[PDB]
Symmetry: C3
Subunit: 281 residues, 3 copies
């Protein structure tokens, strides 16, 4: 199924009939960082499998819902169960839910992920406000926009220089200062590693030479689809480890260690993003 | 449809019957840089859609013709409407028209494109004679030759060290000097960004560290198919902007600004390439 | 055909019935480096085409057998006719033979290849013990594990930091010292170029800046599938040329020159790997 205007419209029609909510804000949350979705007020939970033209996700399994309701007095829509390109989903499958958000009325998309630290100033448990990216799949002919352009959503050749909104970054930092956890908050450039292997020690050393601050396996495809159709983005990485230190010390990362960092910061990240949603212009 | 010997032969048969021209030279022109094709003498215009085994292009739309005739007393064949891999065309679709050129008798391929400047010596409106390339899709398993080898055209493992003919570069520079616009002409290494997003500010900074002089979204796939089957190549980039300066100053590029640079240099590029065609050994 | 547990099991069943050998060790040999396979004792030769669910290889042609028997008193299984991703094989086709090795009982995989030298200390005819890698296809969304995870074999997010076993590297070096050819043996980081074009002169210069010691078109996909399912790996490159010197001197490489280096070192490499097999813990 192509992520075109007609197909996204049919999905938006089903959603509008079922939910009654007109959202201004969309959220996509990283693994272990989804507790806020369970606190949406007057919620409506819509399984992906029920929505016309949504991608099939039963090979991977696990949760896959769209959730609509209110947070802090604002109308939002959340994806519960993210689609990652390392699972084998196509460009069209990743893009359709973001384009449905656009047709529903979304103007701002908030995104969190888990990532590895490259910059020597980053420690496990730190947050990074993403200010730009290096898209290795995109340089190598696997950009999320490869294919026919869908003109109703955006231009054939987009400019990504303002993909990460500067005023949203400033508001996120302001709130961290108000609650005295600004010592945990950095800014940086995100490298997209297609995955699903954690980058090797020698790949990490290469990324340090190339000016990357953090590395991960998500987020950049959604950012590019959002920028293409005029949705503003704030993206925040939670740092699981420092891959450069680990390479010097011959220490390994694993998914168990990653999820333990998620649990350590989940409640603070929930409080942070609730206040960001409440304060958005 | 595979770009094999039998399929390319059927297309060359149709063309020979219809056109009566036996070309020695092929040309592929960048966007806004196609005026020379409209001045081919005793022309024959052949829509792609009419030629057996040519790739289907109706999803993208816009012009798509093969044009044969004479320029400066030389027999040429031009592609009017380029195929780009960021549109979703396969390896086989890009390669077949070049292999048809080979069977028609082409020995030299002349190529122009629009590109972004990385080297700090490059300004908008400058020309770059391409002397080598960095093929990010090719390093990442999207090389145009991935697939079975077509032995009738070339070897399984080609060497690209002489892909950009040195004597053709010298002739192009000599002609610029004769007409006193050599101050506009540079040489450089071309990075292939699969596209269709313009490279991000942080991607541009990375390319500066890696020794790239210019970046664009075309040309390298055609160069590799030509080199594989023994066709000599001259490739010239027209510089739309300097991406490094733009990143320092937070200025954006867009397709409108690019086409305006094309119009500013179109007539000089037309005159230049007409003289190159006339003077080729 | 997916490289899943059921499909790999059906192939392992056929093999066990036909061969009677229970192998502990697997080998994959580079081009021109396959003489050891012809000396396996009490051999059983099984054409790929006869084995349920093995990938179809008739478009490329040439040899394709699985060979089981004894070397130095140890039970082994060899692939005679390698599958390379630049031929157009999918992730699933490359992975299935390695996962069949796992089900047959393989605990150690020994791999050889031909490669280009980047590090200035490397000459034609040298050997490199691979200690880590830079996986350009993997950074760019063509990792061999992209797709659903096959949980019976390994985890969704593998760590590759110990993919190249350190004690196996030490044993290989010890044997070189015993036979007084240690002056030929180096260690280094391997860059995976998807292929099939030899890297360009400017790509080689880029790899020198990025800390790569050698470059080639194979091996990393098999290493990653082996690491994912807990098989230890030793990988050795035979150096065909130094690509950096060749770029400075405008000298070309070609497949004929590569195979001549293979023939010069084939008998010593055969003797080396026979002793490694005999001595494995
Ligand atoms: C969470 C995570 C993702 C990655 C990546 O290579 O994409 C790494 C090293 N970590 C720790
Ligand atoms: C014309 C053009 C192409 C590209 C590219 O990233 O491929 C850029 C930055 N410009 C200006
Ligand atoms: C044997 C070989 C492979 C490669 C590669 O680019 O992958 C090179 C340069 N050589 C010499």
């Amino acid at each position: 199924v192509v992520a075109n205007y007609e197909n996204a419209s049919m999905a938006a029609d089903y959603i509008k009939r079922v939910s009654n909510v007109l959202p201004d804000i969309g959220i996509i949350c990283g693994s272990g960082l989804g507790k806020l979705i369970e606190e949406i007020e007057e919620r409506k939970v819509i399984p992906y499998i029920n929505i016309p033209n949504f991608p099939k996700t039963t090979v991977a399994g696990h949760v896959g819902n769209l959730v609509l309701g209110s947070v802090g007095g604002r109308k939002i829509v959340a994806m519960q169960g993210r689609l990652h390109m390392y699972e084998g989903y196509s460009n069209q499958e990743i893009a359709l839910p973001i384009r449905v958000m656009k047709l529903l009325g979304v103007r701002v998309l908030l995104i969190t992920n888990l990532a590895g630290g490259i910059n020597r100033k980053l420690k496990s448990g730190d947050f990074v406000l993403i200010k730009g990216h290096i898209n290795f799949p995109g340089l190598g002919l696997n950009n999320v926009l490869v294919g026919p352009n869908q003109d109703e959503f955006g231009p054939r050749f987009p400019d990504l220089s303002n993909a990460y909104d500067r005023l949203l970054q400033q508001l996120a930092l302001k709130i961290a200062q108000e609650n005295d956890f600004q010592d945990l908050v950095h800014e940086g450039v995100y490298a997209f590693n297609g995955g699903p292997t954690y980058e090797s020690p020698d790949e990490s050393n290469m990324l340090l030479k190339l000016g990357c601050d953090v590395v991960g396996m998500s987020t950049v495809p959604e950012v590019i689809i959002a920028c293409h159709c005029g949705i503003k983005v704030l993206a925040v990485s939670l740092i699981a480890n420092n891959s450069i230190l680990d390479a010097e010390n011959d220490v390994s990362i694993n998914h168990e260690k990653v999820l333990a960092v998620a649990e350590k910061r989940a409640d603070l990240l929930q409080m942070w993003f609730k206040e960001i949603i409440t304060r958005l212009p």
